[PDB]
Amino acid sequence: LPVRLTNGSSSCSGTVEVRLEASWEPACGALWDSRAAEAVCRALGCGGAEAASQLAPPAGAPALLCSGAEWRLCEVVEHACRSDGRRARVTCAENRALRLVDGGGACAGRVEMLEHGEWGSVCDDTWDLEDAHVVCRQLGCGWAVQALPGLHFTPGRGPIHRDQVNCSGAEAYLWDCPGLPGQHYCGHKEDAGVVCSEHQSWRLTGGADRCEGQVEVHFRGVWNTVCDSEWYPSEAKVLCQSLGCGTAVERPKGLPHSLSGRMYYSCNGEELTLSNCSWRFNNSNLCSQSLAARVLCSASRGH
Ligand SMILES: *[C@@H]1O[C@H](CO)[C@@H](O)[C@H](O)[C@H]1NC(C)=O
């Protein structure tokens, strides 16, 4: 009012935008000194400015001119910069962020939060699906499957930003929820975790050991089968390598699809995991007459 921060980590971070009579336009990358960064961060109510950056996107645009480090001394100009040029970005002192660590891939792991330039963990006391649902939506992983307690994933280090969290469910961020700070009540043994809908975990059931059997995948909070139509050595090489059982040896004939859903994959061969490949979940055109794909790796007792 009349400044805001969009497409960033929080409401106190991201690309700078200025309000006009027509619509909100991004601020100019040039003419963006640290004086204007302080004035904008302080006016929004986000404390001081930690760092100012200039990002490039893949009539003219407005700019923010300030004679001092205050909002009263700042002035907006209508046209004084090239339109399709580098924009202005900023991270204030009150900026917060969120990350999941040690969870065998993206959209899962230990819930870590950023507060005043320090990555800290959240306690498992009063941790439920209502708190996990807020975490999965802000990151872009859909809904929450399981709100895990401590010791499921590796415990964190450093500070503990929350000893108790009680989200209603509709909050945009985890920091907006009512809670209690780090008062030495909880410890790193109780570091909370989460499993979101978009996370992908794999295993091989049916065979002699862990690196042999039916290719199963945990997507959308349910175990699913893999289509044998597009299951060639390129896909099998990525699977046996990610699980850690060497190269692929054989791809036996599958059984009918007997789980919640069906998964499709199309790898080049050099991927680190099957989630990095091109995939489509529950596609009737690609998967119909197919069977549940299988694989036999090198490290198994069967080979
Ligand atoms: C936790 O949040 C719910 C609303 O989701 C509220 O009814 C309840 O009183 C809160 N717990 C405490 C201890 O205030």
In 105-179, where does DSSP find H-type helix? 129-139
CA 168 to ligand 1 centroid distance, Å: 7
Q: How far apart are alpha carbons 117 and 164 in whole angstroms? A: 21
User: Atom 3 (ligand 1): residue with closest C-alpha?
Assistant: 168
User: Atom 12 (ligand 1): residue with closest C-alpha?
Assistant: 166
CA 166 to ligand 1 centroid distance, Å: 6
Bridge-partner residues for 165, per DSSP?
179
**What are phi and psi for residue 296, nearest 5 degrees?**
-125, 115
Q: How many residues does the chain have?
A: 303
Q: How far apart are alpha carbons 16 and 78 in whole angstroms? A: 15
Please tell me whether residue 235 adopts helix, strand or coil conformation.
Answer: helix
Element (H, E) at 32: none
Q: Does residue 178's CB lie within 6 angstroms of at least one atom of ligand 1?
A: no
C-alpha distances in Å from residue 265, one per residue of 107, 113, 232, 269: 19, 33, 10, 11
Nearest to 29 by CA among 53, 2, 5: 53
C-alpha distances in Å from residue 80, one per residue of 40, 62, 63, 104, 117: 19, 6, 7, 49, 34
Token pair of 79 as six digits: 């046209």
Q: How far apart are alpha carbons 21 and 23 in whole angstroms? A: 6
What one-letter code names the amino acid at 210?
R
What one-letter code names the amino acid at 284?
S
Domains of the chain: 1-94 (no CATH), 95-198 (3.10.250.10), 199-303 (3.10.250.10)
Angle at 74 between CA 44 and CA 16, to 5 degrees: 50
CA 169 to ligand 1 centroid distance, Å: 11
131 close to 146: Cβ distance less than 8 angstroms? no
User: Atom 6 (ligand 1): residue with closest C-alpha?
Assistant: 168
Angle at 124 between CA 120 and CA 109, to 5 degrees: 60
Compute CA 210 distance to the chain's CA centroid, rounded to the nearest angstrom.
29
List of residues 6+ apart from 163 with CB closer than 8 A: 123, 125, 179, 180, 181, 182, 183, 185, 186
147 close to 129: Cβ distance less than 8 angstroms? yes
List of residues 6+ apart from 81 with CB closer than 8 A: 28, 29, 30, 31, 60, 61, 62, 63
User: Atom 9 (ligand 1): residue with closest C-alpha?
Assistant: 166
Q: How far apart are alpha carbons 35 and 247 in whole angstroms? A: 57
Q: Does residue 166's CB lie within 6 angstroms of at least one atom of ligand 1?
A: yes
CA 167 to ligand 1 centroid distance, Å: 8
